[PDB]
Ligand binder design. Sequence first.
Ligand SMILES: Nc1nc2c(c(=O)[nH]1)N(C=O)[C@@H](CNc1ccc(C(=O)N[C@@H](CCC(=O)O)C(=O)O)cc1)CN2
Ligand SMILES: [Ca+2]
Ligand SMILES: [Cl-]
Length: 159
Amino acid sequence: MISLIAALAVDRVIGMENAMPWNLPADLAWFKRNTLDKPVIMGRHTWESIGRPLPGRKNIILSSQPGTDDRVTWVKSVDEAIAACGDVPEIMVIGGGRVYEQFLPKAQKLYLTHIDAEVEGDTHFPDYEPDDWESVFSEFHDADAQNSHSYCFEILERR
Ligand SMILES: Nc1nc2c(c(=O)[nH]1)N(C=O)[C@@H](CNc1ccc(C(=O)N[C@@H](CCC(=O)O)C(=O)O)cc1)CN2
Ligand SMILES: [Ca+2]
Ligand SMILES: [Cl-]
């Protein structure tokens, strides 16, 4: 089963963690908690931006180009990405935009972080409609000594 996990700035703008204007260690901890011990699928740009395989998870990179790092698994299609995961209960797709769009239709859950910050960007998470999803968990948090901005964690199930 496919799950998408993303951090959204205002107006659903998305980008690479290392380039966003916030510093939210609480969100990275949530991300870790929610992906640990699960396969993670990402596109090429996100892989390059993270730089090293995320430990404790199977890292899968979706790319039409040949692989350039033997430390991760490279696939060329959505179906191939899912076959390479094996029989696992949940597959975490971690973006970017195009990757989110290719898996959305198959996704059954969404783990989102809504961050209260305005960012200019050209890439946005795709629209999800109120009728197709149920918010099953939500948790609001204020900015603090370690977290630059306020954020809300949320879990949605396809309805
Ligand atoms: N919640 C959430 N989802 C997201 C992002 C995010 O920042 N937050 N990212 C884009 O905004 C993308 C993922 N980018 C990531 C970039 C770096 C790390 C990372 O270093 N995580 C370490 C945590 C240890 C540490 O805290 O340094 C890990 O998971 O092991 C994770 C995700 C997409 N999905
Ligand atoms: Ca940053
Ligand atoms: Cl990407």
